[PDB]
Amino acid sequence: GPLSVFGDRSTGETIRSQNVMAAASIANIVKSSLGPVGLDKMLVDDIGDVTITNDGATILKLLEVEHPAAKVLCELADLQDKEVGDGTTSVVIIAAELLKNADELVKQKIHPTSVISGYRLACKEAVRYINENLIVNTDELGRDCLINAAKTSMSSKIIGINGDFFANMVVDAVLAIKYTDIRGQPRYPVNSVNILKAHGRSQMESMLISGYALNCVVGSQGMPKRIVNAKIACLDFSLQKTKMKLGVQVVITDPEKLDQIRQRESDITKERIQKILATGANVILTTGGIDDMCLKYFVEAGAMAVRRVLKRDLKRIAKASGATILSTLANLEGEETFEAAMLGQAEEVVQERICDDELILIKNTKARTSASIILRGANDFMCDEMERSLHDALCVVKRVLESKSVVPGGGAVEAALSIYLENYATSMGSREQLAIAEFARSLLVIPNTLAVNAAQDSTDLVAKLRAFHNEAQVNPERKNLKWIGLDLSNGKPRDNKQAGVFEPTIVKVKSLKFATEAAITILRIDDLIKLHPESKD
Amino acid sequence: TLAFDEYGRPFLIIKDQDRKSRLMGLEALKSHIMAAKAVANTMRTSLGPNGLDKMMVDKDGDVTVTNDGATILSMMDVDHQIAKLMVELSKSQDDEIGDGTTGVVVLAGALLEEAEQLLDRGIHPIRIADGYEQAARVAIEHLDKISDSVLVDIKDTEPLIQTAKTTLGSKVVNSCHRQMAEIAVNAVLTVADMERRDVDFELIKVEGKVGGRLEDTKLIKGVIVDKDFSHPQMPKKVEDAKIAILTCPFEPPKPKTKHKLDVTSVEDYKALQKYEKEKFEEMIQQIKETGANLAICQWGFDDEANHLLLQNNLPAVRWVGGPEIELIAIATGGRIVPRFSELTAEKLGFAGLVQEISFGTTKDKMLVIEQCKNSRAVTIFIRGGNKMIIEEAKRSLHDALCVIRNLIRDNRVVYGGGAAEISCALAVSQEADKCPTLEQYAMRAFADALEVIPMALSENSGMNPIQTMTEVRARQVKEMNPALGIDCLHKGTNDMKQQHVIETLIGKKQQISLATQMVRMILKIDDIRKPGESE
Amino acid sequence: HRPVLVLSQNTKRESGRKVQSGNINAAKTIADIIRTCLGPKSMMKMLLDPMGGIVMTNDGNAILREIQVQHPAAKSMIEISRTQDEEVGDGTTSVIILAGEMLSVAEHFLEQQMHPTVVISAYRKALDDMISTLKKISIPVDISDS
Amino acid sequence: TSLGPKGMDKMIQDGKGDVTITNDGATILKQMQVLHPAARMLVELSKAQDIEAGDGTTSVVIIAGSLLDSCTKLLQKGIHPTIISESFQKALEKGIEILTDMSRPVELSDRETLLNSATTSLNSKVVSQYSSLLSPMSVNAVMKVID
Amino acid sequence: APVNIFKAGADEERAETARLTSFIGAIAIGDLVKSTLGPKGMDKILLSSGRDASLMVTNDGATILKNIGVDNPAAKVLVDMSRVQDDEVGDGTTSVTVLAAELLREAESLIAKKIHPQTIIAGWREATKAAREALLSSAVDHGSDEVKFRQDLMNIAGTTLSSKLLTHHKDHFTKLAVEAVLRLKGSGNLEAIHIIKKLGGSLADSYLDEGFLLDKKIGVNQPKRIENAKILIANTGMDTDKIKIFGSRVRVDSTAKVAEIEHAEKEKMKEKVERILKHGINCFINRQLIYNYPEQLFGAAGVMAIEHADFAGVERLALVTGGEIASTFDHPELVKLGSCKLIEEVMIGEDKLIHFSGVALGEACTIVLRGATQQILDEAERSLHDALCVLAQTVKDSRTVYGGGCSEMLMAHAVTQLANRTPGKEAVAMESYAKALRMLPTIIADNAGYDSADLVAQLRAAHSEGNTTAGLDMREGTIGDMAILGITESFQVKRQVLLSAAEAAEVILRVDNIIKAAPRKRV
Ligand SMILES: Nc1ncnc2c1ncn2[C@@H]1O[C@H](COP(=O)(O)OP(=O)(O)O)[C@@H](O)[C@H]1O
Numbered sequence A: 001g002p003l004s005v006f007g008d009r010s011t012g013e014t015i016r017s018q019n020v021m022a023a024a025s026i027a028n029i030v031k032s033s034l035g036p037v038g039l040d041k042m043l044v045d046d047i048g049d050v051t052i053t054n055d056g057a058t059i060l061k062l063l064e065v066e067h068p069a070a071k072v073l074c075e076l077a078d079l080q081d082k083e084v085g086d087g088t089t090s091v092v093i094i095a096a097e098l099l100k101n102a103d104e105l106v107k108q109k110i111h112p113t114s115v116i117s118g119y120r121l122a123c124k125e126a127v128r129y130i131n132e133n134l135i136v137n138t139d140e141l142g143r144d145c146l147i148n149a150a151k152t153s154m155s156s157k158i159i160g161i162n163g164d165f166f167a168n169m170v171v172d173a174v175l176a177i178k179y180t181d182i183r184g185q186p187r188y189p190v191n192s193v194n195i196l197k198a199h200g201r202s203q204m205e206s207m208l209i210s211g212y213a214l215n216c217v218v219g220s221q222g223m224p225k226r227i228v229n230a231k232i233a234c235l236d237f238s239l240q241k242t243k244m245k246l247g248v249q250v251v252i253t254d255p256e257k258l259d260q261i262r263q264r265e266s267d268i269t270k271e272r273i274q275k276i277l278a279t280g281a282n283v284i285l286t287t288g289g290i291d292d293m294c295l296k297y298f299v300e301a302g303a304m305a306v307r308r309v310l311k312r313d314l315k316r317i318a319k320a321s322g323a324t325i326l327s328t329l330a331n332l333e334g335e336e337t338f339e340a341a342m343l344g345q346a347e348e349v350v351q352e353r354i355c356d357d358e359l360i361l362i363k364n365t366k367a368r369t370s371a372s373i374i375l376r377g378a379n380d381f382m383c384d385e386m387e388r389s390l391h392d393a394l395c396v397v398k399r400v401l402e403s404k405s406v407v408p409g410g411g412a413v414e415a416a417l418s419i420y421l422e423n424y425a426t427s428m429g430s431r432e433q434l435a436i437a438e439f440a441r442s443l444l445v446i447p448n449t450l451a452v453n454a455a456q457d458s459t460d461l462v463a464k465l466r467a468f469h470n471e472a473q474v475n476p477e478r479k480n481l482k483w484i485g486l487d488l489s490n491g492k493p494r495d496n497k498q499a500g501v502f503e504p505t506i507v508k509v510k511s512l513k514f515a516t517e518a519a520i521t522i523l524r525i526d527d528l529i530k531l532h533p534e535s536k537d
Numbered sequence B: 001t002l003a004f005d006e007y008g009r010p011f012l013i014i015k016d017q018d019r020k021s022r023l024m025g026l027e028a029l030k031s032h033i034m035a036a037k038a039v040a041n042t043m044r045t046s047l048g049p050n051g052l053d054k055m056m057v058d059k060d061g062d063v064t065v066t067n068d069g070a071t072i073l074s075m076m077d078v079d080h081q082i083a084k085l086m087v088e089l090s091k092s093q094d095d096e097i098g099d100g101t102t103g104v105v106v107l108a109g110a111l112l113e114e115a116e117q118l119l120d121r122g123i124h125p126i127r128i129a130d131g132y133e134q135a136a137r138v139a140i141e142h143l144d145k146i147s148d149s150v151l152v153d154i155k156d157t158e159p160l161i162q163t164a165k166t167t168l169g170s171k172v173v174n175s176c177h178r179q180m181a182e183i184a185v186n187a188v189l190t191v192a193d194m195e196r197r198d199v200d201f202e203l204i205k206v207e208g209k210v211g212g213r214l215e216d217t218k219l220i221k222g223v224i225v226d227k228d229f230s231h232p233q234m235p236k237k238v239e240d241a242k243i244a245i246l247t248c249p250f251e252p253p254k255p256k257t258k259h260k261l262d263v264t265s266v267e268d269y270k271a272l273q274k275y276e277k278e279k280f281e282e283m284i285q286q287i288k289e290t291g292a293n294l295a296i297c298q299w300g301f302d303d304e305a306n307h308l309l310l311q312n313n314l315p316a317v318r319w320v321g322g323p324e325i326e327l328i329a330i331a332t333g334g335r336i337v338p339r340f341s342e343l344t345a346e347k348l349g350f351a352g353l354v355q356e357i358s359f360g361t362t363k364d365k366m367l368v369i370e371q372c373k374n375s376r377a378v379t380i381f382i383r384g385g386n387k388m389i390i391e392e393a394k395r396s397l398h399d400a401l402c403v404i405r406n407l408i409r410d411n412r413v414v415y416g417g418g419a420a421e422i423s424c425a426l427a428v429s430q431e432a433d434k435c436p437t438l439e440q441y442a443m444r445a446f447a448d449a450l451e452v453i454p455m456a457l458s459e460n461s462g463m464n465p466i467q468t469m470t471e472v473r474a475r476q477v478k479e480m481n482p483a484l485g486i487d488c489l490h491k492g493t494n495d496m497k498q499q500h501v502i503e504t505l506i507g508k509k510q511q512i513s514l515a516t517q518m519v520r521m522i523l524k525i526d527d528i529r530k531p532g533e534s535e
Numbered sequence C: 001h002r003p004v005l006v007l008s009q010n011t012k013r014e015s016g017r018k019v020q021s022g023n024i025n026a027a028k029t030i031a032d033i034i035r036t037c038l039g040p041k042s043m044m045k046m047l048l049d050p051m052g053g054i055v056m057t058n059d060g061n062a063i064l065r066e067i068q069v070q071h072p073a074a075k076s077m078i079e080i081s082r083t084q085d086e087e088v089g090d091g092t093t094s095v096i097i098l099a100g101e102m103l104s105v106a107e108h109f110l111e112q113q114m115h116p117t118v119v120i121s122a123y124r125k126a127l128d129d130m131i132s133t134l135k136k137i138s139i140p141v142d143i144s145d146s
Numbered sequence D: 001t002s003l004g005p006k007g008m009d010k011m012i013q014d015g016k017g018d019v020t021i022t023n024d025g026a027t028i029l030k031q032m033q034v035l036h037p038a039a040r041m042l043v044e045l046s047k048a049q050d051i052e053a054g055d056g057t058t059s060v061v062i063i064a065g066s067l068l069d070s071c072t073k074l075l076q077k078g079i080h081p082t083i084i085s086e087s088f089q090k091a092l093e094k095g096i097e098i099l100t101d102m103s104r105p106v107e108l109s110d111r112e113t114l115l116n117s118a119t120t121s122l123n124s125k126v127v128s129q130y131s132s133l134l135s136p137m138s139v140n141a142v143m144k145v146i147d
Numbered sequence E: 001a002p003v004n005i006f007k008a009g010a011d012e013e014r015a016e017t018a019r020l021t022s023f024i025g026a027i028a029i030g031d032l033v034k035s036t037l038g039p040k041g042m043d044k045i046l047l048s049s050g051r052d053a054s055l056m057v058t059n060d061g062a063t064i065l066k067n068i069g070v071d072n073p074a075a076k077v078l079v080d081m082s083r084v085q086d087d088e089v090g091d092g093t094t095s096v097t098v099l100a101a102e103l104l105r106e107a108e109s110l111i112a113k114k115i116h117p118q119t120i121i122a123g124w125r126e127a128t129k130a131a132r133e134a135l136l137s138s139a140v141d142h143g144s145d146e147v148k149f150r151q152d153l154m155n156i157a158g159t160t161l162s163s164k165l166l167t168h169h170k171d172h173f174t175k176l177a178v179e180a181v182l183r184l185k186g187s188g189n190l191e192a193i194h195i196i197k198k199l200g201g202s203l204a205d206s207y208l209d210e211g212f213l214l215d216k217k218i219g220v221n222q223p224k225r226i227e228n229a230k231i232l233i234a235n236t237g238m239d240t241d242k243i244k245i246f247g248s249r250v251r252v253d254s255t256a257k258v259a260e261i262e263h264a265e266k267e268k269m270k271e272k273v274e275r276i277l278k279h280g281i282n283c284f285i286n287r288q289l290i291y292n293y294p295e296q297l298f299g300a301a302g303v304m305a306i307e308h309a310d311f312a313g314v315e316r317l318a319l320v321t322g323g324e325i326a327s328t329f330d331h332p333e334l335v336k337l338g339s340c341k342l343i344e345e346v347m348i349g350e351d352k353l354i355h356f357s358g359v360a361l362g363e364a365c366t367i368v369l370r371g372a373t374q375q376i377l378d379e380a381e382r383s384l385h386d387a388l389c390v391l392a393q394t395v396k397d398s399r400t401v402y403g404g405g406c407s408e409m410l411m412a413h414a415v416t417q418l419a420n421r422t423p424g425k426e427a428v429a430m431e432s433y434a435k436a437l438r439m440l441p442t443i444i445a446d447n448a449g450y451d452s453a454d455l456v457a458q459l460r461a462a463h464s465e466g467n468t469t470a471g472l473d474m475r476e477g478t479i480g481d482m483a484i485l486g487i488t489e490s491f492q493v494k495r496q497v498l499l500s501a502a503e504a505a506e507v508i509l510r511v512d513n514i515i516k517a518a519p520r521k522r523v
């Protein structure tokens, strides 16, 4: 008679109501961590680890989910870090409210393919309207655009101070790693900034190290820990005793030739260490291993040798100091040449005190003048929060300098799109106009969440918010009310042009493209079959 | 999600909702059809004169072989609420008419099978149910076209015997197909009130005793009770019985209240002996002064009163049931007397051969009343080879007693053997085109389901269903439609008027009416709220 | 045995006033443990180790490291005393009492329907004024004197 | 409910934990893992449609699910199943001659004819809103490698 | 109904295992009692698992099937069929069980031949009608010439007792069975022949008493034997009467009046016995118990007193002495007394029984069964009960047929003669009816160890051309004449074997669905 599957089958409006409650179970979590009045959470594990964070990606990655519609919204937050980097609480609330308003349409016996086709006409029109209603590029504002866009990202986190201490350190970090490319591409690789953590003084003592901050120790306590006018030798091979390979064995037939082979394992080893040290090299960085026999040659000659450094840290030092990453001997059948003209340069390599640990600093690197940020917090829970908040702040200034276009934040984009799409649904709307009209109400949840978390008036402040944006579209008298946002500290609509509340363009363009595409896949689960777990057979 | 909210709170609506079962879907209507078709496919093989019986085993281990559709569905342990409505459908046909209890379940399963293909085409289930009411109305009006009977209950019992042979032809009484059919005709006409057209089945006592054969079933005009002569030397044959029916035990009169009679002297104790000695001589003389020679008593006898019956030549039975003596006073024309002082010659019953008959080696000795005088109560004595053939004959002959009762309620007949179902299927197909606006597909599903009952007779008779039904249905359109059906041995031609296959009009009128309304209550349901396990 | 259709299985959810006023009581509980170990009239506190040893001390850092707590906000206060132990020497017991008292007065304003970002923005303005006060009342030290 | 441009997709979550959304009839029946032995032959029917045609997978189950459903009344009329198998072949051999009369001979050089054929198969999937890009890319990926 | 089963703990089957379980369960019943059919068949011993098992050996097919408790649903029809055969005629319960099982065994052969089961029912109804005319036309009546009817009655008892434990006792037990029914001289009540089983002695030591035996010996100080006595029986209360007035007390003022009441109670009990001895009797039988106060009154007057014989003990004494029950003693001129010659007490098996020797109008008998064990006495009682019930109906229906396989070949010949005048649809079912009738002499021939394949073939060749009295001779193992050897059975016994087996095989063959319900307290 029925289906003889050994799992479970649920059809109809059961799964159509379960996917909305699965998406609302995720959105109601992250609704309390949006905007400058948002608050952080606690993520306690079974082993006892506590993670205090408010970013939309760190919470949903550590949180376990079971529903298939819940894994779509959790993987939607992971894509926002790679594509944009701060846009990762706002996408989850929009994509869940896109399913909440579309559930009210399919309960009115409206076909979901008209809602899918109605959402594509509203998503492509939202990108078209936001690209024709921008204020200015990065020429008029200058450095004031980079600082004000950085403070908007920090307002939802622990580094949202009233001053410009953390804002100036981010702009000075991205501007110091300007790496040009072919065909006129000024790239800004923000992954080259080594963000370090140390439980020390307050947040106002966060050092901006112009150069690189290596997270390693010297090793042997007989080397000079401060070298002025240093020459960095970046190399990746273990400075240990000469061990033969698997194909080579030592089969001796004469007992007199025994001790000459035993001394040869250290003579070939020390032959490399004397030709890399006679060329003026004082700092040697190694990703392999330097044993206790080879540490004597640096104490005797007065050189610094750092062992077991990361491979991702050696590439950031050799590119910034002009050093060449050498793995072995080379240069056309040469015995030991080392190409001594390709040594790195540094002004000062100094191991400072980082509150009961050792940290090596390189000052200005003499070639590229890179930057590294050492964070200072109260405990380890604040340092993990300060690292995530700084990494999201580095991604904001990266997209502004690459794509010179900013949009007003604080719900100013979602207020203008809530009224333009209602007029867009009336012109060319015959049967898909109800999906475009619900696309505007789903976008209004971003200024609605700012009024809930601020404990302000909800149905009056957003009603006063769209009152200025309606007069900016139907009354062409140059009212300039396209930048009207929210003042959550006062509870009144303010102008985000003069207040300095700036967000990048692709933090909302890619947010509206990812949330609309995720809402289509969850809208097509009218039939769902769940099989039994095959564990013990 | 279920049992949890989006804010983390537990979401409990009803108690024990984890062990519940709820289906709305599109398979909730599909689960009702597949549960009802398996009941109709079971009862399809037990339809017609070639219908094979079914063996039913009770919970106590008792085995009863039944063929009627009322007792088959009633003795099941089906815990399915859709199939439980098919049990009450066959019970409602037995309580009202009592002949088509098998055919009303195959017809209801046929209407649901034709509605399954109509459900996949997008038709609403109430729209099919509203289309079946407009289609069953045509089958009622077309069934009243050819209907006539000439029963006068004097000498024209020939339409009454042939009507009962159609009901008894499908049972296991075909060896007594002419003998037992005449028993059920004369048993109704002697007890029915023709002035009110009312038949009382309390006057027709159906008793059974193992032994003999099926041909030894006789219609005893009178009563058959278990004779309990307290004296073993009582005469076992009374030629002319003046029956004295009484309801007082042969004892000194005991009151209904607490007495605690006091005895003080020895003159009061000697007065106790003379009080009871004259009381047993008074209760015996008051029967003999009325001229009675037979006594019936509901309660027990005393040992002192037993020998006084033999001295006065007065046979008497002991410990008769409640409604058993109620049948004696009607069969003999006497009156039931409460006391002994109210006995008279006018309250005596008249009977002829009053005797007890021993059956083989048993010690039952039932009463046989041969002669009577204008009795309004008869008793059928069913004999057989085992208790399986007797309890079925009690159920088979009860269906024969009901079809004679339906002829007194309505003297209009039809012709069975599938002849009325093919003729009614042509009436719905002719009115499906007048007009085919909305309910065209619902009326054609009704006419295709009315043809399941005659094609089930062709399947049980070893013929082909679609070959035989196409021949009979085409002959009713090329000429005026006769009583044209089928049979098992086929009796030569297929004319039901010549083969004397006669069924009642109101029997088939309630087969279409009850199956349509039961289909409407199982099509107009879109949810099931059954629980899970028992505990 | 059919599985229950749930989301985020075997985890807890808690928000509202029970977390804001719940982390204050966890901070007040640790500050009452080492409250009798600040002045010169303090007393030792004998502790018992899972290895079988005994730590009899009155220092605020060595007491909190021997306490295994289950509350998440109570685990934050133990890492505060570990930070004060590595930066300075005698900067342990004073921070745990002071952070419990700054959260004691912070619980009063959370009942007055005030947002927690207003109290923190007032705490950061107060923190910048406490550094400037200690630098005015300081005194230079002759390190050459014994 | 997964047939036509107005059809909806199905999501099958297996016992391992790899839940995928599928609309093609061959991919649905291979993930359902039906235990009934007569229903597993309908899974292999949609598999050979994916091999031979590639675009006949959901429709081969609607036909075979209805040809057996039409045999429900045929087996309740005393018709032998060998007689139904002879008559289904006579309806099959006459069915190809009806579809041949509806066919129109086309040429692969006409890009507008090949574009409208690929756009029809994309209307039932999730990429029906992306038929302005995927359907031109499906024709150009074929007509440059076939010679 | 198996597909998408809507039952809780109940199961069913339709046309696949329905006729399979019906044919397995019915043949295994007939193959069980197959070894007990015939004059050379063995017997069974029935035993339980424990808890007063009470082993009861029986050769009769009704007593075997009523105690086994078969769990098969279709096998209970053949169990109930043999129960009616024991209650109606008292013989042929084994013959009706094998015949009803051989019909369904031949019906199982028609499974693979694709014969419709309603055609087999219509073919067997015409076969049973042809078999009724074979027994009716071959029945031998006996009216006058009573010296041939008493010889015919000994052939009935000799045929019934030959298939039981009383094998080499036909010279004695035939006279004990014929003369017991011959002394009834009326209706076959089958309760005046009181069978008393006593241990000790062989079966040849058993005898038919000329008078009547009883228990509950004569009083304490009463005479044990009175010659030429007048027997008066009774069914009245003697002492502690509490006479029929519920709610009557003795409410006096002093204890001296209680002594006057209890003396007045004993005077009315003395006056009741004085009304009994006015008839002029010497023996007294009461169905109720006689206490000490009337027992002294009968002992002082020289009158016997038999207290609490039986409820049916006063009925047999009323038929063996020619009196009446006489529960009220107020008219001595309307009470008929019994007659006897000796009321001496005899000792049978160290138990003193009251022997009513020399009674007049003795329409009651007493069979004193003596055996080696209790198992032999329980078998010989049922063997005599299977012989007295046929002779009680042979005197009511004097028609007799020739048994020993001769009646079955006459019935099988009439079916085969009409099977050739029928079309081929029903002729195959009629040939299977005639083959099952020939199985009944085949079971008898093979139980002795004879060549059953040739003796039934010689019976079929004999009955095909004349020889209406030719049957199976189990003495020498050949074919002989049944009128010469004297092997006859009653007509009503052989009719009920044919008719009840044809009706019971009609019910089981018409079953296509066995829907058994969920039993109670079975897990
Ligand atoms: N000063 C401010 N005034 C008003 N709104 C603000 C201000 N600063 C930030 N916001 C709002 O707070 C929101 C924070 O979003 P966020 O959680 O950072 O997104 P994501 O999770 O993608 O990084 C932004 O959408 C922005 O509109």
Ligand SMILES: Nc1ncnc2c1ncn2[C@@H]1O[C@H](COP(=O)(O)OP(=O)(O)O)[C@@H](O)[C@H]1O
Pocket (backbone or CB within 6 Å): B046, B047, B048, B049, B068, B069, B070, B093, B098, B099, B100, B101, B102, B103, B104, B166, B167, B169, B170, B399, B416, B417, B418, B457, B485, B486, B487, B488, B499, B501
């Ligand atoms: N001689 C016959 N020829 C053809 N059909 C017959 C004959 N006798 C009975 N039938 C058919 O057999 C059917 C038996 O129905 P039945 O099971 O008795 O209904 P119910 O269960 O209501 O009593 C009737 O509908 C009748 O048409």
Ligand SMILES: Nc1ncnc2c1ncn2[C@@H]1O[C@H](COP(=O)(O)OP(=O)(O)O)[C@@H](O)[C@H]1O
Pocket (backbone or CB within 6 Å): C037, C038, C039, C040, C060, C061, C084, C089, C090, C091, C092, C093, C094, C095
């Ligand atoms: N003689 C004293 N008079 C007054 N106060 C004192 C005296 N000695 C110590 N104290 C106070 O006792 C406190 C002890 O702090 P302590 O617990 O040692 O801090 P930490 O835990 O950082 O080492 C100091 O803050 C100091 O002000």
Ligand SMILES: Nc1ncnc2c1ncn2[C@@H]1O[C@H](COP(=O)(O)OP(=O)(O)O)[C@@H](O)[C@H]1O
Pocket (backbone or CB within 6 Å): D002, D003, D004, D005, D024, D025, D026, D049, D054, D055, D056, D057, D058, D059, D060, D120, D121, D123, D124
């Ligand atoms: N634009 C359209 N208008 C109407 N029907 C369409 C359109 N596009 C596709 N269809 C229908 O949708 C159906 C999709 O069938 P499909 O599931 O692709 O079959 P298969 O599983 O064999 O590939 C086709 O039968 C076609 O008739």
Ligand SMILES: Nc1ncnc2c1ncn2[C@@H]1O[C@H](COP(=O)(O)OP(=O)(O)O)[C@@H](O)[C@H]1O
Pocket (backbone or CB within 6 Å): E036, E037, E038, E039, E060, E061, E062, E085, E090, E091, E092, E093, E094, E095, E096, E158, E159, E160, E162, E163, E386, E403, E404, E405, E444, E472, E473, E474, E487
């Ligand atoms: N002397 C004899 N010669 C031939 N056959 C005999 C003789 N005595 C008994 N039989 C056969 O043995 C069979 C015994 O049947 P039985 O078991 O008594 O049937 P049931 O159990 O119904 O009484 C009879 O059918 C009879 O034909």
Ligand SMILES: [Mg+2]
Pocket (backbone or CB within 6 Å): B099, B166, B167, B168, B170, B171, B399
């Ligand atoms: Mg009937």
Ligand SMILES: [Mg+2]
Pocket (backbone or CB within 6 Å): D055, D120, D121, D122, D124
């Ligand atoms: Mg397709």
Ligand SMILES: [Mg+2]
Pocket (backbone or CB within 6 Å): E091, E092, E159, E160, E163, E386
């Ligand atoms: Mg016998």
